[PDB]
C-alpha cells in the first residue's frame, strides 16, 4: 500500500471499468457490419451451449454483408437457428460453407435506441471512472497523513492520480462516440 501501489490499483480499476464499457458497447447492433456481433451467441450443439467462434468463423467481407463459416455442416445448421432468435432481426441464407446475411439499414427507431444506448454507456463508464479518482485520492489523503509527505510530495501524487483519471475518461470517450459513429452509419 504505497504511492506507486496506489498508481497501479487506480489504473487497474479504470481499466476494468472501461472494458465493462467495451463490453456494453459491443453489445450493440452497430451499422450491424460487425461481425463481433454474432460471436457471443450460444449455439446449441450436442446438447451444449457453445460459443459460435469455437464452432464457425465470420468476417465481415463488405459493410453491408456477414459472412458464417462453419466446418460443421450440421452446426451451421443450428447457428442459422440461432442468428435470429433475437432482436437482431437478421436473415441468413443457405449456402456452401458458410452462411450468408445482409445487413439491412437500420430503422431511425431502433438507431435512437442505439445512439441513445451509447451516451448512457459513456456516461455510465466517466461516472466509475470518476469514483475511482475518488476512491483514490480518499487514500491518498490517509496515506499522505500517515506517512507524513510533504506538500510537493502529496500534491505531486493527486496530479498523477489526475492524470490516470483523464487518459481513461479521454478513452472512454473515444470508444463511445467511434460506436457512435458506426451506429449513425
Same mark, same amino acid.
Given at each position: ?15 476494468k ?33 457453445v ?18 463459416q ?7 445448421? #443450428? =447457428?442459422e437457428?440461432?442468428i +435470429?432468435?433475437?432482436?437482431?432481426? !437478421?436473415?441468413?441464407?443457405? @449456402?456452401?460453407?458458410? /452462411? ?27 461516472? #466509475? =471512472?470518476?469514483?475511482?479518482? +475518488?476512491?483514490?485520492?480518499?487514500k !491518498?489523503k490517509?496515506?499522505? @497523513?500517515?506517512?507524513? /509527505?510533504?506538500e510537493?510530495?502529496?500534491k ?15 478513452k ?14
Amino acid at each position: 500500500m504505497t504511492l506507486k501501489e496506489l498508481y497501479a490499483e487506480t489504473r487497474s480499476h479504470m481499466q476494468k471499468s472501461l472494458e465493462v464499457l467495451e463490453h456494453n458497447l459491443a453489445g450493440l447492433r452497430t451499422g450491424r457490419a460487425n461481425p463481433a456481433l454474432l460471436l457471443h451467441l450460444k449455439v446449441e450443439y450436442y446438447g451444449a451451449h457453445v460459443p459460435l467462434n469455437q464452432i464457425a468463423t465470420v468476417t465481415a467481407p463488405d459493410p453491408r454483408t456477414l459472412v458464417v463459416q462453419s466446418w460443421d455442416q450440421n452446426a451451421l445448421k #443450428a =447457428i442459422e437457428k440461432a442468428i +435470429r432468435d433475437s432482436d437482431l432481426g !437478421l436473415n441468413p441464407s443457405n @449456402k456452401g460453407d458458410a /452462411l450468408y446475411i445482409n445487413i439491412p439499414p437500420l430503422t431511425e427507431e431502433r438507431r435512437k435506441d442505439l445512439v441513445r444506448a451509447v451516451r448512457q454507456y459513456a456516461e455510465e463508464g466517466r461516472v #466509475a =471512472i470518476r469514483n475511482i479518482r +475518488r476512491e483514490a485520492l480518499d487514500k !491518498l489523503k490517509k496515506l499522505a @497523513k500517515e506517512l507524513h /509527505l510533504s506538500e510537493d510530495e502529496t500534491k505531486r501524487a493527486e496530479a498523477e492520480i489526475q492524470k490516470i483519471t483523464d487518459e481513461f475518461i479521454a478513452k472512454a470517450d473515444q470508444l463511445a462516440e467511434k460506436k457512435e459513429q458506426e451506429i449513425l452509419g
